[PDB]
Design a protein around this ligand. Structure first.
Ligand SMILES: [Mg+2]
Ligand SMILES: [Zn+2]
Ligand SMILES: [Zn+2]
Lengths: 50, 74, 1331, 98, 49
DNA sequence: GTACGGAAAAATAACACGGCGAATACCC
DNA sequence: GGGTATTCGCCGTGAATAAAAAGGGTAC
RNA sequence: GCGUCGCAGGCCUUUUUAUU
RNA sequence: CCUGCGACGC
């Protein structure tokens, strides 16, 4: 959706945006796994243990 | 089009009288309606005057003797 | 028109200005909008309220023009005459003007020779004054009290006259002859020996001559008739509710008119004196509040608790008529929008929105629609534009193709902030800016806005195309460096493309050209970093203009061959075969502009930006958590550092070292640990590669994105990588000290709360410094512009021989600028001779380009005398030979360029990068020393001592030039002589600090003369067995019986006779100053060099602001004004007496020195004019009045460049010399012979030069002058032009002096032509003024 | 924001300020210094007289641009006349001599 | 605010100094559309005549 | 609800630096 | 009592623009 | 291609926020 | 005096 420039990361020292990027990618991966489990007909026990 | 004007600066002495000579040449085409020497290609009188400076067909002495011949004609 | 003339206004002139008299205080009715009969808003005085209609009626027509009605008497004319007609107020009592009374120095107090307090008591009805008492005890001007007037009345009833108020001041100013008083003041000035009395007498004589030469009268200061403002300049605006709100000037005029009417009504009824005195006092206070509210007393406030605006508040200040309505105005045909980036644009064009271009080009589209015939009526063309039809966009595209626009940012620090571009019609509401001009504009794309402007005339379009085009401004006029340097993305793409690795796809194949390299890269058969063999065809123009081609097989990569298609023919291949960083591309563009020219350089920069933006996207560089690696040896270095801190703390706990040494050792070991961490991190980040060529590993340069972005110079430096990967290190405090506990973590791992709270101090300090520097920077830039606005190049060669000597500056550590960076682009004053033979190497009037610099650098030349701006003999301007080059083009400076404005904009621009918050020498290399200005004597041990005050220690290498320069004190010894050389790295000079010894020149018997115990010397026994010495008592706390008893050590021989010094006939005695501890008792044979007596002891932007203002330091270094022998005198319990006795002439000199300051000068020495007495910062006035103009010029230039060199700022020396020349423009007359000048007045330098030249041409004697130095504020006010002095600062006193002097002000400059609105004498306006 | 022509003030005949009043941009002192640093004398004279102050000058300039002529008359700014009338009201005689 | 898929790479100089490249699907989904409400008054006062 | 606009309480308020001129105190 | 010569007041100065409110006469 | 009639507008000071 | 609006004459 958005293409940013990595040139401002060594000069302006804000490394927390890259950690927020990685953590949001992991959170979206967990959310897409939950959505892929909910899109197909799955039971309650496997979803609960996941 | 005229991106750089270095060939116009190389003809006359400095860059300040270039503006006055090109303005005196450009006012003859828009107000007086005089036909230019260089064939125009979708250009205004500023670019035509700068090209006439660049080709060497227009300077201060040429405009002076042309105004003198116009005063002697009429 | 001609020059501007300002003088005093007679009451007849005020009555001639007026058209009527205002008598009622009311302005206008509240229920009816019609004006009053006779008021501040009138119809029969100032003019009608509507166009060609009267007030009563029946004359609202056009045939009746200028007629006078019989009902109300209103002239039927236009409404435009209402903003120019004035009125007058006939005051019943005279009033004093507050400008000629309260503005120091007082014009009434200096003319009447009276203090200001007595005139304030007389004017405000608090004291009496006698006027022409006659044959009485009272004099002509005496200050009487309330009771003394009654005593003088009851004692001398007849032949007496005493008045109180402004009538007494008017009678004193009226009954006074100027010529007789001026002649009496001259005859009193001839019999004058005092200093300050002479100053006051010359000031009063100059004021009297100013009143005599001007046509004004001294009694015109007392106001009799008071003029008013036109009503359109102070209107009554309507409100929505219906109530008409009043202004400040209308309220003050209403108050003055009401008080004058009350005074007239009270004077009609014959009131006693007590009430009418208070009424006249209230009228005086009302007039003073109307003229200047705030000077005398308290400023009156109405309904807002704020001081009201007077007639003087609209002229001075930031909201005055000069700085808000004349120097800076709001213009038409302009816009403003947020800027964006356009990658597809060229260097000469920009992206303009259609919605802004349709509005900014309305009458051009109207004229084209009326010419084409699509709209005959202008309303039809307006409706066609407002409807936005199809042909309207075609007309707009037709009228925009070759019509430039002026793009401008909000902070305009220099001339590159307003550049011209060609508009490209884009869709949107943002302006597309070229990426290459962002370095010149200093504007990124995080929310910045820029303003656009549209030229209309042909001259303005030609000035935008020829002078203000972005393709014409590629070199900065401050230093000559380019401004089209590539930014981070372009250098990142050109760094990634031009690299190599030891093993890739397609390595080791022979290529026939760059087209095959591009084909193999775009086909996917060869990598971008692969060592191949490409057959290139490079051209070289080493012949007479023509280009020669050659063909050979090069060992290069694939990406460099692709970039070789961008490089033109004239450039060689050795500039592209390496890894392109940032300075490599900068010197590539420099070489292209140097060899080829200007026209291919624009296309080269555009194609470089295009290929950089194309090849930065194909890489895919990105930051991550794995790119910032952690050194594996960081934890063990932190462990050894903590173990060393624990060992130092355990050593401190036992009591072996102090707290300061413990803190210093902790700071040093933590700095060593931080350096080891940074070294290990840089060693881990350099290679980071184990790649196989065929089967075995091989190290290479890392392809990490952080290292590639930090090594190529795109963004970030080594300190950023140290703070991101290694430890942050030591951090400072707000108090200034350094915390002993550093930050042992980085931004990659988790910081704690304390390490963040420590760094918040430095972050807040940097933010506050950045926020508070900008006002001082803008003030300094404004002062430099207003002090250097009238320096235009007017000639070519004045024919002078003066000039400064250019030498490379040496401080003691290393050199900073060589001779080439200081001599390039300057015309020499004298012929530079060869060091071997006295033949002429280069003529004088030669512009030294790079070839002359290369010819001078090989002949070992250090001193080149060049022509300077301050040493030019051109009246009212400079010439083209004393300035040098243009610093933006290759030719000489043209005739008509404003060199002062570019100098002030070059100095004032990097002010935002400065700061605002507050025993032995060692040589560097091997070379022979050069000892200059040294007087020595050979001792018995073989050393070399110094018997002089100042001594220059310079180092001369084998080439014959000066590389180093040191300074040695008075008492010191040298390890080696002047003949032998230094091997390098050893101590040459060594001396003990905090001591001031005395060294003798002869060796003999020492005797004690005038030394008695108990009075002038104290024999104390120290508790240690080593120290048993004699102390000489100071001459302040001694008794009264020994004031003239001064000790001295006479040196005799063993036979008792007095030996003499070879060269003179004085004894070799050495007196003892106060607090001088001698060694022991006399009776020992000393050597030549012995130790006899023991005498113990803001930088950045405020530094430049104090240097340019010629400010005196807090502790100035006192110098010797006249040469001769130093001698001390009898002190008067305060400052210490000193006197310099010459050798041939008399002694008209006596000065005092404060006794608390340290003086490194003994009793009897030999000093000259220029030597110092104490140690400290010097003042430029003493350097000007003692050494000369060139010495203080070099001092100011070096002191400014030493501040500007610490921050890495490159500013040429001629821009400082412009301000140095503008600082010294006046002169002080010493002996005026056959001239119209006075004795001690200040005139201009060019005026006294013209006067002396005319007196020499007429065969008469000239005048002797002395040049004085003034600051950037004082030189802007002490100018012959009163308009430029009033518009800058202090409008009230400048207008007061121009009124009492009667100054006639010719324009002759830029700022005066800005105010009146005509062509300035610079650029095309200079040629217009010449034609 | 963009503007060719519009409303003017009463005391000083200058364009207004602000987007809501349809005003124009301000050509401050630093822009005047940057224009003086060039050789652009006609552009500064057009910015100071025709585009800002001179009523007759700006009407003749509008009629010349509509007719098709790029020529201006300098004239006299109204703010200088306001300054002369305000200094002259303080009892000081200042006038242009010829 | 909103959270979207992001990438850190140069794209043809369209993220040159601080610029941001936004896709068209962010505009089509209308996830950054804001509503702004103004106020226009009409005061009817009592006056003469 | 029309009409003089001032000065004394106000339970007022209160910057750092620099240059120039006047009151005044040292020194014979 | 003349000539200095430190003190102490006082005035002038302190960057550049866009939006959004609030108030334009209070007393006896 | 202009002129006549009617309507609306041209401000000042202070405070706050934001940007460069 | 200048802008914008509505109307009318030759
Ligand atoms: Mg920004
Ligand atoms: Zn009438
Ligand atoms: Zn010269």
């Amino acid at each position: 959706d958005i293409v940013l420039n990595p040139l401002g990361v060594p000069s302006r020292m804000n490394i927390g945006q890259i950690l927020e990027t990685h953590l949001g990618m992991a959170a979206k991966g967990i959310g897409d796994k939950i959505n892929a489990m909910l899109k197909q007909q799955q039971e309650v026990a496997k979803l609960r243990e996941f | 089009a005229r991106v750089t004007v270095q060939d116009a600066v190389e003809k006359i002495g400095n860059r300040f009288d270039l503006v006055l000579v090109a303005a005196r040449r450009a006012r003859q085409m828009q107000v007086g309606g005089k036909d230019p020497l260089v064939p125009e290609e979708n250009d205004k009188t500023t670019v035509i005057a700068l090209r006439e400076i660049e080709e060497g067909l227009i300077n201060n002495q040429i405009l002076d003797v042309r105004e003198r011949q116009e005063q002697q004609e009429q | 028109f001609d020059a501007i003339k300002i003088a005093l206004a007679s009451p007849d002139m005020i009555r001639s200005w007026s058209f009527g008299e205002v008598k009622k205080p009311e302005t206008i009715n509240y229920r009816t909008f019609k004006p009053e009969r006779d008021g501040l808003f009138c119809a029969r005085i100032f003019g009608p309220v509507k166009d060609y209609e009267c007030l009563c009626g029946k004359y609202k027509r056009l045939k009746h023009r200028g007629v006078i009605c019989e009902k109300c008497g209103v002239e039927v004319t236009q409404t435009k005459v209402r903003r120019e007609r004035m009125g007058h107020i006939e005051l019943a009592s005279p009033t004093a003007h507050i400008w000629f009374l309260k503005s120091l120095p007082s014009r009434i107090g200096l003319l009447l020779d009276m203090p200001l307090r007595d005139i304030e008591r007389v004017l405000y009805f608090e004291s009496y004054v006698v006027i022409e008492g006659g044959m009485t005890n009272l004099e002509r001007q005496q200050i009487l009290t309330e009771e003394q007037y009654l005593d003088a009345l009851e004692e001398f009833g007849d032949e007496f006259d005493a008045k109180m108020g402004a009538e007494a001041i008017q009678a004193l100013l009226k009954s006074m002859d100027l010529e007789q008083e001026c002649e009496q003041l001259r005859e009193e000035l001839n019999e004058t020996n005092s200093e300050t009395k002479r100053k006051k007498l010359t000031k009063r004589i100059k004021l009297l001559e100013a009143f005599v030469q001007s046509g004004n009268k001294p009694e015109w200061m007392i106001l009799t008739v008071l003029p008013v403002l036109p009503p359109d300049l102070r209107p009554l605006v309507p409100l929505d509710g219906g109530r008409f709100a009043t202004s400040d000037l209308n309220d003050l005029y209403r108050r003055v008119i009401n008080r004058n009417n009350r005074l007239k009504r009270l004077l009609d009824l014959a009131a006693p004196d007590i009430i009418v005195r208070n009424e006249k006092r209230m009228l005086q206070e009302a007039v003073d509040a109307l003229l200047d509210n705030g000077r005398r007393g308290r400023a009156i406030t109405g309904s807002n608790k704020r001081p009201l605006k007077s007639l003087a508040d609209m002229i001075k200040g930031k909201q005055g008529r000069f700085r808000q309505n004349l120097l800076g105005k709001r213009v038409d045909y302009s816009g403003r929008s947020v800027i964006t980036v356009g990658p597809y644009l060229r260097l000469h064009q920009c992206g303009l929105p259609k919605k802004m271009a349709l509005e900014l080009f309305k009458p051009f589209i109207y004229g084209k629609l009326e010419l084409r015939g699509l709209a005959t009526t202008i309303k039809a063309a307006k409706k066609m534009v407002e409807r936005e039809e199809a042909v309207v966009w075609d007309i707009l595209d037709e009228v925009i193709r070759e019509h430039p626009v002026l793009l401008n940012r909000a902070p305009t620090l220099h001339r590159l902030g307003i550049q011209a571009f060609e508009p490209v019609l884009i869709e949107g509401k943002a302006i597309q800016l070229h990426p290459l001009v962002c370095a010149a504009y200093n504007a990124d794309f995080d929310g910045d806005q820029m303003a656009v402007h549209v030229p209309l005339t042909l001259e303005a379009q030609l000035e935008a195309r020829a002078l203000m085009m972005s393709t014409n401004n590629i070199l900065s006029p401050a230093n000559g460096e380019p401004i089209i340097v590539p930014s981070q993305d372009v250098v990142l793409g050109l760094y990634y493309m031009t690299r190599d690795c030891v093993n890739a796809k397609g390595e080791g194949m022979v290529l026939t050209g760059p087209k095959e390299a591009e084909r193999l890269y775009r086909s996917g058969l060869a990598s971008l970093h692969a060592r191949v063999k490409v057959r290139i065809t490079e051209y070289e123009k080493d012949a007479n203009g023509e280009l020669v081609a050659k063909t050979s097989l090069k060992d290069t990569t694939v990406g460099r061959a692709i970039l070789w298609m961008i490089v033109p023919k004239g450039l060689p291949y050795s500039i592209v075969n390496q890894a392109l960083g940032k300075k490599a591309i900068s010197k590539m563009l420099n070489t292209c502009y140097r060899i080829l020219g200007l026209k291919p350089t624009v296309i080269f920069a555009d194609q470089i930006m295009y290929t950089g933006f194309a090849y930065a996207a194909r890489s895919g560089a990105s930051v991550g958590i794995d790119d910032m690696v952690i050194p594996e040896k960081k934890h063990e270095i932190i462990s050894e550092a903590e173990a060393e801190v624990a060992e130092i703390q355990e050593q401190f706990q036992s009591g072996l070292v102090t707290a300061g040494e413990r803190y210093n050792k902790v700071i040093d070991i933590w700095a060593a640990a931080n350096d080891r961490v940074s070294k290990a991190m840089m060693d881990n980040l350099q290679t980071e590669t184990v790649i196989n060529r065929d089967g075995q590993e091989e190290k290479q340069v890392s392809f990490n994105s952080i290292y590639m972005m930090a090594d190529s110079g795109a963004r970030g430096s080594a300190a950023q990588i140290r703070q991101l990967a290694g430890m942050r290190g030591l951090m400072a405090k707000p108090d200034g000290s350094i915390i002993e506990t550093p930050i042992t973590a980085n931004f990659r791992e988790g910081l704690n709360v304390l390490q963040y709270f420590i760094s918040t101090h430095g972050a807040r300090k940097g933010l506050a410094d950045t926020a508070l520097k900008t006002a001082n920077s803008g003030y300094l830039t404004r002062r430099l512009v207003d002090v250097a606005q009238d320096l235009v190049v007017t000639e070519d060669d004045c024919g002078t021989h003066e000039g400064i000597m250019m030498t490379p500056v040496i401080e003691g550590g290393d050199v900073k600028e060589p001779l080439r960076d200081r001599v390039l682009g300057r015309v020499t004053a004298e012929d530079v001779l060869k060091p071997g033979t006295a033949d002429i190497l280069v003529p004088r009037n030669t512009l030294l380009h790079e070839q002359w610099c290369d010819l001078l650098e090989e002949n070992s030349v250090d001193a080149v005398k060049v022509r300077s701006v301050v040493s030019c003999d051109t009246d009212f301007g400079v010439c083209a030979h004393c300035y040098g080059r243009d610093l933006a083009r290759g030719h000489i400076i043209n005739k008509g360029e404003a060199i002062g404005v570019i100098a002030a904009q070059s100095i004032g621009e990097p002010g935002t990068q400065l700061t605002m918050r507050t025993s032995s020498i060692q040589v560097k290399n091997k070379g022979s020393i050069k000892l200059s200005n040294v007087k020595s004597v050979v001792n018995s041990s073989g050393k070399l001592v110094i018997t002089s005050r100042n001594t220059e220690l310079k180092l001369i290498d084998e080439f014959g030039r000066t590389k180093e320069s040191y300074k040695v004190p008075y008492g010191a010894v040298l390890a080696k002589g002047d003949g032998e050389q230094v091997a390098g790295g050893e101590t040459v000079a060594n001396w003990d600090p905090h001591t001031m010894p005395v060294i003798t020149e002869v060796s003999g018997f020492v005797r004690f003369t005038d030394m008695i115990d108990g009075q002038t010397i104290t024999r104390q026994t120290d508790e240690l067995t080593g120290l048993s010495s004699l102390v000489v008592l100071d001459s302040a706390e001694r008794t009264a019986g020994g004031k003239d008893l001064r000790p001295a050590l006479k040196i005799v021989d063993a036979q008792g006779n007095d030996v003499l010094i070879p060269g003179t006939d004085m004894p070799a005695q050495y007196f003892l100053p106060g607090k001088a501890i001698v060694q022991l008792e006399d009776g020992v044979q000393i050597s030549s060099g012995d130790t006899l007596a023991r005498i113990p002891q803001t930088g950045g932007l405020p530094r430049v602001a104090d240097l340019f203002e010629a400010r005196r330091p807090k502790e100035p270094a006192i110098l010797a004004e006249i040469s001769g022998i130093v001698s001390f005198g009898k002190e008067t319990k305060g400052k210490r007496r000193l006197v310099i006795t010459p050798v041939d002439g008399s002694d008209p000199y006596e000065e005092m020195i404060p006794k608390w300051r340290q003086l490194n000068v003994f009793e009897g020495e030999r000093v000259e004019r220029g030597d110092v007495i104490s140690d400290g910062p010097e003042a430029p006035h003493d350097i000007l009045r003692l050494r000369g103009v060139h010495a203080v010029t070099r001092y100011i230039v070096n002191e400014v460049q030493d501040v500007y060199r610490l921050q890495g700022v490159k500013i040429n020396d001629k821009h400082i010399e412009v301000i140095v020349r503008q600082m010294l423009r006046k002169a002080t007359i010493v002996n005026a012979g056959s001239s119209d000048f006075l004795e001690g007045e200040q005139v201009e330098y060019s005026r006294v030069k013209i006067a002396n030249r005319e007196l020499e041409a007429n065969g008469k004697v000239g005048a002797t002058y002395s040049r004085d130095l003034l600051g950037i504020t004082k030189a802007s006010l002490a100018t012959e032009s009163f308009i430029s002095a009033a518009s800058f600062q202090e409008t009230t006193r400048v207008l007061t002096e121009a009124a009492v002097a009667g100054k006639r002000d010719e324009l002759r400059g830029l700022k005066e032509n800005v105010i009146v609105g005509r062509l300035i004498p610079a650029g095309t306006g200079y040629a217009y003024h010449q034609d | 924001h963009a503007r060719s022509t519009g409303s003017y003030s009463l005391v000083t005949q200058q364009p207004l300020g602000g987007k809501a009043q349809f005003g124009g941009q301000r050509f401050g002192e630093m822009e005047v210094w940057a224009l003086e640093a060039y050789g652009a004398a006609y552009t500064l004279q057009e910015m100071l007289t025709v585009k800002s102050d001179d009523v007759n000058g700006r009407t003749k300039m509008y009629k010349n641009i509509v007719d098709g002529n790029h020529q201006m008359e300098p004239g006299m700014p109204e703010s200088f006349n306001v300054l002369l009338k305000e200094i002259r009201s303080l009892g000081i005689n200042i006038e242009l001599e010829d | 605010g909103q959270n979207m898929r992001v990438a850190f790479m140069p794209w043809n100089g369209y993220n040159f100094e601080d610029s941001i490249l936004v896709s068209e699907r962010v505009v089509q989904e209308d996830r950054f559309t804001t509503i702004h409400i103004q106020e226009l008054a009409c005061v009817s006062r009592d006056t003469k005549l």
